[PDB]
Amino acid sequence: QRWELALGRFWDYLRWVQTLSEQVQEELLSSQVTQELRALMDETMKELKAYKSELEEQLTPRARLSKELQAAQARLGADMEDVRGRLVQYRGEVQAMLGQSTEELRVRLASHLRKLRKRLLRDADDLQKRLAVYQ
Numbered sequence: 001q002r003w004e005l006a007l008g009r010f011w012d013y014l015r016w017v018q019t020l021s022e023q024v025q026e027e028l029l030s031s032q033v034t035q036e037l038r039a040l041m042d043e044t045m046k047e048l049k050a051y052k053s054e055l056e057e058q059l060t061p062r063a064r065l066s067k068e069l070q071a072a073q074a075r076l077g078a079d080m081e082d083v084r085g086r087l088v089q090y091r092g093e094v095q096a097m098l099g100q101s102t103e104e105l106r107v108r109l110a111s112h113l114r115k116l117r118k119r120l121l122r123d124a125d126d127l128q129k130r131l132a133v134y135q
Contacts, residue, residue, distance in 0.1 A: 001047075001051060002047045002050075002051065003044060003047035003048040003050075003051050004124075004128070006040070006043045006044040006046075006047045006048075007044045007076075007124060009040055009043075010037070010040040010041060010044055010080060011120070013036060013037060013040055014037070014083060014113070014117070017033055017037070017087065017113070018110065018113050018114075018117075020106050020109065020110060028087055028090065028091055029091055029094060029095075031091070033087055034084055034087050034088050034091070037080075037083065037084045037087065038084060041077075041080040041081065041083075041084060044076075044080065045073075045076075045077050045080075048073060048076070048127075049073075051131070052069070052073065052131070055131065055134055055135050058135070062134070065130065065133065065134060066134070068130065069127075069130045069131065069134055072123065072126050072127040072130050073127065075119075075123045075126075075127075076120070076123045076124055076127055079116055079119045079120050079123055080120075082116055083113065083116050083120075086109060086112045086113065086116070087109075090105060090106075090109050093105055
């Protein structure tokens with residue numbers, strides 16, 4: 001699916017960001033990372049909505065699976081939005097610290113991202129299965 005490929009590009013970027021290399025940190029504090037993740041997330045949600053709408057339009061006279069599918073869409077979007085939000089929060093916290101060690105913040109950020117990756121795995125799988133049934 002187009003939306004699955006767009007989600008793949010989001011994943012590809014997130015796996016690099018997780019490393020929290022000094023290059024990642026440069027591009028996080030400059031806002032390049034959060035700008036790019038926003039673009040990747042918006043494309044994923046745009047393609048997912050377009051696909052769902054095409055399926056919708058293909059159907060005849062399920063009404064419950066429809067609301068549960070809307071919820072599965074929303075969960076994926078919320079997962080991606082929370083990845084971005086954690087990275088924006090990290091940047092704001094570092095700006096506030098006058099050059100002192102960030103190490104504790106990066107350990108906490110890395111943990112938030114690992115938990116979000118588990119959620120992304122399960123929420124995308126649920127959404128894929130639900131879309132296939134809906135079709």
